[PDB]
Amino acid sequence: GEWEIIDIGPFTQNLGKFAVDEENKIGQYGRLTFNKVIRPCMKKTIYENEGFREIKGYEYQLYVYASDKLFRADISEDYKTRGRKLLRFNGPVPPP
């Protein structure tokens, strides 16, 4: 909840897939063949309102493999809409 790693599995796969699908739909790096997602796959709750503060959503920073090229995707989830979206797709970047 507070900067924690999530279980890689169908859930994470789906979000990484969605990230690649969005990226592919834009065509910014043409059309890549999503493979999987691997660590790190870190999530944090996202607030807004300020001052008083209020929960608004979450963010997910994960390393997605597509066409055997590893990219970092940052995804948002807005609580109220209850919908995710790609914040950014950086890379290719090698693992440490």
GROMACS .gro file of N, CA, C and O in nm:
model
  384
    1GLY      N    1   0.083  -0.123   0.000
    1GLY     CA    2   0.000   0.000   0.000
    1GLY      C    3   0.086   0.127   0.000
    1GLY      O    4   0.062   0.220  -0.078
    2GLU      N    5   0.186   0.129   0.089
    2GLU     CA    6   0.288   0.232   0.097
    2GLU      C    7   0.415   0.174   0.035
    2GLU      O    8   0.479   0.091   0.100
    3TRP      N    9   0.447   0.212  -0.089
    3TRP     CA   10   0.560   0.162  -0.168
    3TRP      C   11   0.594   0.015  -0.140
    3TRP      O   12   0.697  -0.015  -0.079
    4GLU      N   13   0.510  -0.077  -0.188
    4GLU     CA   14   0.526  -0.221  -0.167
    4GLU      C   15   0.526  -0.293  -0.301
    4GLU      O   16   0.471  -0.241  -0.398
    5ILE      N   17   0.587  -0.411  -0.308
    5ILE     CA   18   0.594  -0.491  -0.429
    5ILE      C   19   0.465  -0.572  -0.440
    5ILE      O   20   0.413  -0.618  -0.338
    6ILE      N   21   0.414  -0.591  -0.562
    6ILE     CA   22   0.295  -0.671  -0.588
    6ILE      C   23   0.333  -0.805  -0.651
    6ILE      O   24   0.438  -0.819  -0.713
    7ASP      N   25   0.247  -0.906  -0.633
    7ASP     CA   26   0.267  -1.040  -0.685
    7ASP      C   27   0.254  -1.037  -0.837
    7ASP      O   28   0.146  -1.007  -0.888
    8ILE      N   29   0.360  -1.074  -0.908
    8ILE     CA   30   0.358  -1.091  -1.051
    8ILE      C   31   0.274  -1.216  -1.083
    8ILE      O   32   0.294  -1.321  -1.024
    9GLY      N   33   0.178  -1.201  -1.174
    9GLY     CA   34   0.079  -1.303  -1.205
    9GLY      C   35  -0.021  -1.241  -1.302
    9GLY      O   36   0.007  -1.132  -1.354
   10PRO      N   37  -0.137  -1.305  -1.327
   10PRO     CA   38  -0.233  -1.262  -1.427
   10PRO      C   39  -0.270  -1.114  -1.414
   10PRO      O   40  -0.278  -1.044  -1.515
   11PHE      N   41  -0.289  -1.065  -1.292
   11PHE     CA   42  -0.315  -0.924  -1.264
   11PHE      C   43  -0.207  -0.834  -1.325
   11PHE      O   44  -0.235  -0.748  -1.409
   12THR      N   45  -0.082  -0.852  -1.282
   12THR     CA   46   0.029  -0.768  -1.326
   12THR      C   47   0.049  -0.784  -1.476
   12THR      O   48   0.069  -0.685  -1.547
   13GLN      N   49   0.043  -0.909  -1.524
   13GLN     CA   50   0.050  -0.940  -1.664
   13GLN      C   51  -0.052  -0.854  -1.739
   13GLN      O   52  -0.013  -0.783  -1.830
   14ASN      N   53  -0.179  -0.857  -1.697
   14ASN     CA   54  -0.285  -0.779  -1.759
   14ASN      C   55  -0.249  -0.631  -1.768
   14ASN      O   56  -0.260  -0.571  -1.874
   15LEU      N   57  -0.203  -0.571  -1.657
   15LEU     CA   58  -0.168  -0.430  -1.658
   15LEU      C   59  -0.051  -0.401  -1.752
   15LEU      O   60  -0.055  -0.306  -1.830
   16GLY      N   61   0.055  -0.483  -1.746
   16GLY     CA   62   0.167  -0.469  -1.838
   16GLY      C   63   0.121  -0.482  -1.983
   16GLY      O   64   0.161  -0.404  -2.070
   17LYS      N   65   0.034  -0.579  -2.008
   17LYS     CA   66  -0.024  -0.604  -2.138
   17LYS      C   67  -0.095  -0.478  -2.186
   17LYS      O   68  -0.069  -0.430  -2.295
   18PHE      N   69  -0.185  -0.426  -2.102
   18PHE     CA   70  -0.258  -0.303  -2.125
   18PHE      C   71  -0.162  -0.188  -2.156
   18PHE      O   72  -0.184  -0.114  -2.252
   19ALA      N   73  -0.054  -0.175  -2.079
   19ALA     CA   74   0.047  -0.074  -2.104
   19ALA      C   75   0.103  -0.087  -2.246
   19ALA      O   76   0.106   0.009  -2.323
   20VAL      N   77   0.147  -0.208  -2.281
   20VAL     CA   78   0.199  -0.236  -2.415
   20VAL      C   79   0.091  -0.212  -2.520
   20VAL      O   80   0.121  -0.160  -2.627
   21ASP      N   81  -0.034  -0.250  -2.493
   21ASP     CA   82  -0.145  -0.234  -2.585
   21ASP      C   83  -0.168  -0.086  -2.614
   21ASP      O   84  -0.180  -0.047  -2.730
   22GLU      N   85  -0.171  -0.003  -2.510
   22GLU     CA   86  -0.184   0.141  -2.521
   22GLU      C   87  -0.067   0.196  -2.604
   22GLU      O   88  -0.087   0.265  -2.703
   23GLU      N   89   0.055   0.162  -2.563
   23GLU     CA   90   0.176   0.206  -2.631
   23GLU      C   91   0.169   0.169  -2.780
   23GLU      O   92   0.194   0.253  -2.865
   24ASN      N   93   0.134   0.044  -2.809
   24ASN     CA   94   0.119  -0.009  -2.943
   24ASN      C   95   0.012   0.067  -3.019
   24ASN      O   96   0.030   0.100  -3.136
   25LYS      N   97  -0.102   0.094  -2.954
   25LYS     CA   98  -0.213   0.166  -3.015
   25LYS      C   99  -0.167   0.307  -3.057
   25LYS      O  100  -0.202   0.353  -3.165
   26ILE      N  101  -0.090   0.374  -2.971
   26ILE     CA  102  -0.027   0.501  -3.006
   26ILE      C  103   0.075   0.479  -3.119
   26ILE      O  104   0.083   0.558  -3.213
   27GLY      N  105   0.155   0.373  -3.109
   27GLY     CA  106   0.257   0.335  -3.206
   27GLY      C  107   0.389   0.406  -3.179
   27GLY      O  108   0.475   0.411  -3.267
   28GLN      N  109   0.408   0.460  -3.058
   28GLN     CA  110   0.523   0.544  -3.025
   28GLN      C  111   0.655   0.470  -3.049
   28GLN      O  112   0.751   0.529  -3.098
   29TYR      N  113   0.658   0.341  -3.017
   29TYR     CA  114   0.767   0.249  -3.050
   29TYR      C  115   0.714   0.137  -3.140
   29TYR      O  116   0.750   0.020  -3.125
   30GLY      N  117   0.629   0.172  -3.236
   30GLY     CA  118   0.567   0.075  -3.325
   30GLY      C  119   0.481  -0.022  -3.244
   30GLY      O  120   0.414   0.019  -3.150
   31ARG      N  121   0.481  -0.150  -3.284
   31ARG     CA  122   0.399  -0.255  -3.225
   31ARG      C  123   0.490  -0.362  -3.165
   31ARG      O  124   0.549  -0.440  -3.239
   32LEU      N  125   0.501  -0.368  -3.031
   32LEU     CA  126   0.581  -0.469  -2.963
   32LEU      C  127   0.494  -0.587  -2.920
   32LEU      O  128   0.375  -0.572  -2.894
   33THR      N  129   0.555  -0.706  -2.911
   33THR     CA  130   0.488  -0.828  -2.870
   33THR      C  131   0.508  -0.844  -2.719
   33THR      O  132   0.612  -0.893  -2.676
   34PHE      N  133   0.410  -0.800  -2.639
   34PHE     CA  134   0.412  -0.822  -2.494
   34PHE      C  135   0.452  -0.966  -2.462
   34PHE      O  136   0.397  -1.060  -2.520
   35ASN      N  137   0.548  -0.981  -2.371
   35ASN     CA  138   0.594  -1.110  -2.322
   35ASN      C  139   0.540  -1.133  -2.181
   35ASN      O  140   0.460  -1.224  -2.159
   36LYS      N  141   0.584  -1.052  -2.083
   36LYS     CA  142   0.549  -1.070  -1.943
   36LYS      C  143   0.587  -0.942  -1.867
   36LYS      O  144   0.631  -0.845  -1.930
   37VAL      N  145   0.573  -0.940  -1.734
   37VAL     CA  146   0.621  -0.835  -1.646
   37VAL      C  147   0.710  -0.902  -1.542
   37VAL      O  148   0.679  -1.015  -1.502
   38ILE      N  149   0.819  -0.837  -1.501
   38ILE     CA  150   0.910  -0.889  -1.400
   38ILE      C  151   0.946  -0.779  -1.300
   38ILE      O  152   0.917  -0.662  -1.322
   39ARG      N  153   1.006  -0.819  -1.188
   39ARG     CA  154   1.040  -0.727  -1.080
   39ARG      C  155   1.138  -0.617  -1.125
   39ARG      O  156   1.220  -0.642  -1.213
   40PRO      N  157   1.136  -0.498  -1.063
   40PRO     CA  158   1.045  -0.457  -0.958
   40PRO      C  159   0.906  -0.428  -1.014
   40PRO      O  160   0.890  -0.393  -1.131
   41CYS      N  161   0.804  -0.446  -0.930
   41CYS     CA  162   0.664  -0.421  -0.960
   41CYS      C  163   0.607  -0.356  -0.835
   41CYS      O  164   0.552  -0.425  -0.750
   42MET      N  165   0.629  -0.225  -0.820
   42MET     CA  166   0.603  -0.154  -0.695
   42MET      C  167   0.478  -0.068  -0.707
   42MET      O  168   0.457  -0.004  -0.810
   43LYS      N  169   0.394  -0.067  -0.602
   43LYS     CA  170   0.268   0.005  -0.595
   43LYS      C  171   0.271   0.102  -0.476
   43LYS      O  172   0.326   0.068  -0.371
   44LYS      N  173   0.207   0.218  -0.492
   44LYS     CA  174   0.181   0.312  -0.384
   44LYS      C  175   0.042   0.374  -0.401
   44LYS      O  176   0.000   0.403  -0.514
   45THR      N  177  -0.030   0.394  -0.290
   45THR     CA  178  -0.152   0.474  -0.289
   45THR      C  179  -0.121   0.620  -0.326
   45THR      O  180  -0.017   0.672  -0.286
   46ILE      N  181  -0.211   0.685  -0.401
   46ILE     CA  182  -0.200   0.824  -0.443
   46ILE      C  183  -0.313   0.907  -0.380
   46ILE      O  184  -0.432   0.874  -0.391
   47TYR      N  185  -0.274   1.014  -0.311
   47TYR     CA  186  -0.363   1.110  -0.248
   47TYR      C  187  -0.384   1.230  -0.340
   47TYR      O  188  -0.315   1.246  -0.441
   48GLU      N  189  -0.478   1.316  -0.302
   48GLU     CA  190  -0.501   1.447  -0.359
   48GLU      C  191  -0.567   1.532  -0.249
   48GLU      O  192  -0.537   1.510  -0.131
   49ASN      N  193  -0.653   1.628  -0.285
   49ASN     CA  194  -0.721   1.724  -0.199
   49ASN      C  195  -0.627   1.829  -0.142
   49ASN      O  196  -0.660   1.947  -0.143
   50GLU      N  197  -0.511   1.786  -0.089
   50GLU     CA  198  -0.412   1.869  -0.022
   50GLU      C  199  -0.469   1.922   0.111
   50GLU      O  200  -0.589   1.909   0.137
   51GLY      N  201  -0.382   1.974   0.197
   51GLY     CA  202  -0.416   2.032   0.327
   51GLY      C  203  -0.478   1.928   0.419
   51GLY      O  204  -0.410   1.868   0.501
   52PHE      N  205  -0.609   1.906   0.403
   52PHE     CA  206  -0.683   1.800   0.469
   52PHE      C  207  -0.638   1.663   0.418
   52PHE      O  208  -0.633   1.568   0.495
   53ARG      N  209  -0.606   1.656   0.287
   53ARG     CA  210  -0.570   1.534   0.215
   53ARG      C  211  -0.693   1.446   0.191
   53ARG      O  212  -0.790   1.451   0.267
   54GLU      N  213  -0.690   1.363   0.086
   54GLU     CA  214  -0.787   1.258   0.062
   54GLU      C  215  -0.724   1.157  -0.033
   54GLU      O  216  -0.639   1.195  -0.114
   55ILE      N  217  -0.762   1.029  -0.023
   55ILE     CA  218  -0.719   0.926  -0.117
   55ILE      C  219  -0.786   0.953  -0.252
   55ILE      O  220  -0.906   0.981  -0.254
   56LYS      N  221  -0.712   0.946  -0.363
   56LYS     CA  222  -0.769   0.961  -0.497
   56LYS      C  223  -0.751   0.834  -0.580
   56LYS      O  224  -0.835   0.804  -0.665
   57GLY      N  225  -0.641   0.760  -0.562
   57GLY     CA  226  -0.610   0.651  -0.652
   57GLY      C  227  -0.486   0.576  -0.606
   57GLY      O  228  -0.453   0.577  -0.488
   58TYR      N  229  -0.416   0.511  -0.700
   58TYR     CA  230  -0.291   0.442  -0.677
   58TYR      C  231  -0.204   0.460  -0.801
   58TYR      O  232  -0.256   0.489  -0.909
   59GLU      N  233  -0.074   0.437  -0.786
   59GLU     CA  234   0.022   0.427  -0.895
   59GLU      C  235   0.097   0.294  -0.884
   59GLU      O  236   0.114   0.242  -0.773
   60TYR      N  237   0.140   0.241  -0.999
   60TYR     CA  238   0.212   0.115  -1.012
   60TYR      C  239   0.329   0.138  -1.106
   60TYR      O  240   0.307   0.172  -1.222
   61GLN      N  241   0.451   0.120  -1.058
   61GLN     CA  242   0.574   0.130  -1.137
   61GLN      C  243   0.628  -0.011  -1.157
   61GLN      O  244   0.673  -0.073  -1.060
   62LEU      N  245   0.625  -0.063  -1.280
   62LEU     CA  246   0.660  -0.202  -1.309
   62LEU      C  247   0.744  -0.213  -1.436
   62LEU      O  248   0.740  -0.125  -1.521
   63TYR      N  249   0.825  -0.319  -1.445
   63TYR     CA  250   0.915  -0.344  -1.557
   63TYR      C  251   0.854  -0.451  -1.648
   63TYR      O  252   0.853  -0.570  -1.614
   64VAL      N  253   0.801  -0.408  -1.762
   64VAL     CA  254   0.731  -0.489  -1.860
   64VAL      C  255   0.827  -0.532  -1.971
   64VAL      O  256   0.902  -0.450  -2.024
   65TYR      N  257   0.824  -0.660  -2.007
   65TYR     CA  258   0.900  -0.720  -2.115
   65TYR      C  259   0.811  -0.730  -2.238
   65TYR      O  260   0.705  -0.792  -2.233
   66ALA      N  261   0.854  -0.670  -2.350
   66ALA     CA  262   0.785  -0.678  -2.477
   66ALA      C  263   0.889  -0.694  -2.588
   66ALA      O  264   0.988  -0.623  -2.589
   67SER      N  265   0.870  -0.792  -2.677
   67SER     CA  266   0.966  -0.827  -2.782
   67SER      C  267   1.107  -0.847  -2.726
   67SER      O  268   1.205  -0.803  -2.786
   68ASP      N  269   1.116  -0.911  -2.609
   68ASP     CA  270   1.240  -0.929  -2.533
   68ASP      C  271   1.318  -0.798  -2.513
   68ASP      O  272   1.441  -0.798  -2.504
   69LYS      N  273   1.247  -0.685  -2.502
   69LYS     CA  274   1.300  -0.556  -2.461
   69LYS      C  275   1.225  -0.518  -2.334
   69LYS      O  276   1.103  -0.528  -2.329
   70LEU      N  277   1.299  -0.480  -2.229
   70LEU     CA  278   1.244  -0.447  -2.100
   70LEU      C  279   1.223  -0.296  -2.093
   70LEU      O  280   1.316  -0.219  -2.119
   71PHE      N  281   1.101  -0.252  -2.062
   71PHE     CA  282   1.062  -0.113  -2.047
   71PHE      C  283   1.000  -0.095  -1.909
   71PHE      O  284   0.939  -0.187  -1.857
   72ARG      N  285   1.015   0.024  -1.850
   72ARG     CA  286   0.948   0.060  -1.727
   72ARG      C  287   0.816   0.128  -1.763
   72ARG      O  288   0.817   0.228  -1.835
   73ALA      N  289   0.704   0.076  -1.714
   73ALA     CA  290   0.574   0.139  -1.729
   73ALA      C  291   0.528   0.187  -1.592
   73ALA      O  292   0.537   0.113  -1.494
   74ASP      N  293   0.480   0.312  -1.587
   74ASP     CA  294   0.412   0.368  -1.471
   74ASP      C  295   0.265   0.378  -1.508
   74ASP      O  296   0.231   0.441  -1.608
   75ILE      N  297   0.180   0.313  -1.429
   75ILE     CA  298   0.036   0.305  -1.446
   75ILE      C  299  -0.027   0.380  -1.329
   75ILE      O  300   0.027   0.377  -1.219
   76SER      N  301  -0.141   0.446  -1.352
   76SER     CA  302  -0.225   0.504  -1.248
   76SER      C  303  -0.355   0.425  -1.244
   76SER      O  304  -0.394   0.367  -1.346
   77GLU      N  305  -0.421   0.425  -1.128
   77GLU     CA  306  -0.557   0.376  -1.105
   77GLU      C  307  -0.630   0.486  -1.029
   77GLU      O  308  -0.592   0.515  -0.916
   78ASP      N  309  -0.733   0.545  -1.089
   78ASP     CA  310  -0.816   0.643  -1.020
   78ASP      C  311  -0.926   0.568  -0.946
   78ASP      O  312  -1.001   0.493  -1.009
   79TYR      N  313  -0.938   0.589  -0.814
   79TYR     CA  314  -1.032   0.517  -0.730
   79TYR      C  315  -1.176   0.536  -0.778
   79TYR      O  316  -1.252   0.440  -0.790
   80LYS      N  317  -1.215   0.662  -0.802
   80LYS     CA  318  -1.352   0.700  -0.827
   80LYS      C  319  -1.400   0.646  -0.963
   80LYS      O  320  -1.503   0.581  -0.971
   81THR      N  321  -1.323   0.672  -1.069
   81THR     CA  322  -1.348   0.614  -1.200
   81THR      C  323  -1.334   0.462  -1.192
   81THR      O  324  -1.402   0.389  -1.264
   82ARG      N  325  -1.242   0.416  -1.107
   82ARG     CA  326  -1.207   0.276  -1.090
   82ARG      C  327  -1.147   0.221  -1.219
   82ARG      O  328  -1.166   0.104  -1.253
   83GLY      N  329  -1.073   0.306  -1.289
   83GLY     CA  330  -1.012   0.275  -1.418
   83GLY      C  331  -0.863   0.303  -1.408
   83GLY      O  332  -0.823   0.398  -1.339
   84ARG      N  333  -0.782   0.220  -1.474
   84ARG     CA  334  -0.639   0.241  -1.484
   84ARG      C  335  -0.605   0.318  -1.610
   84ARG      O  336  -0.685   0.325  -1.703
   85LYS      N  337  -0.482   0.370  -1.616
   85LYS     CA  338  -0.426   0.429  -1.736
   85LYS      C  339  -0.274   0.437  -1.728
   85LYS      O  340  -0.218   0.443  -1.619
   86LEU      N  341  -0.206   0.435  -1.843
   86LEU     CA  342  -0.062   0.451  -1.851
   86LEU      C  343  -0.025   0.596  -1.820
   86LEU      O  344  -0.066   0.686  -1.893
   87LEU      N  345   0.053   0.621  -1.714
   87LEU     CA  346   0.114   0.751  -1.691
   87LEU      C  347   0.232   0.768  -1.787
   87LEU      O  348   0.241   0.870  -1.855
   88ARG      N  349   0.323   0.669  -1.793
   88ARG     CA  350   0.438   0.678  -1.882
   88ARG      C  351   0.493   0.539  -1.914
   88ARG      O  352   0.467   0.444  -1.840
   89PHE      N  353   0.570   0.530  -2.023
   89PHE     CA  354   0.638   0.411  -2.071
   89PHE      C  355   0.780   0.452  -2.110
   89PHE      O  356   0.798   0.513  -2.215
   90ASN      N  357   0.879   0.424  -2.024
   90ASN     CA  358   1.018   0.458  -2.048
   90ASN      C  359   1.095   0.332  -2.084
   90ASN      O  360   1.061   0.223  -2.038
   91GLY      N  361   1.202   0.348  -2.161
   91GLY     CA  362   1.294   0.240  -2.195
   91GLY      C  363   1.326   0.243  -2.344
   91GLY      O  364   1.293   0.341  -2.411
   92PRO      N  365   1.390   0.137  -2.397
   92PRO     CA  366   1.425   0.016  -2.324
   92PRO      C  367   1.531   0.044  -2.217
   92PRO      O  368   1.612   0.135  -2.233
   93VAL      N  369   1.529  -0.032  -2.108
   93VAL     CA  370   1.624  -0.023  -1.997
   93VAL      C  371   1.659  -0.165  -1.952
   93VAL      O  372   1.569  -0.246  -1.935
   94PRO      N  373   1.788  -0.198  -1.935
   94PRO     CA  374   1.828  -0.331  -1.891
   94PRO      C  375   1.795  -0.348  -1.742
   94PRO      O  376   1.781  -0.250  -1.670
   95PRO      N  377   1.785  -0.473  -1.693
   95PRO     CA  378   1.775  -0.500  -1.551
   95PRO      C  379   1.909  -0.464  -1.483
   95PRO      O  380   2.013  -0.462  -1.549
   96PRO      N  381   1.909  -0.437  -1.352
   96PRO     CA  382   2.032  -0.408  -1.278
   96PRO      C  383   2.122  -0.532  -1.272
   96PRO      O  384   2.245  -0.512  -1.270
   0.00000   0.00000   0.00000
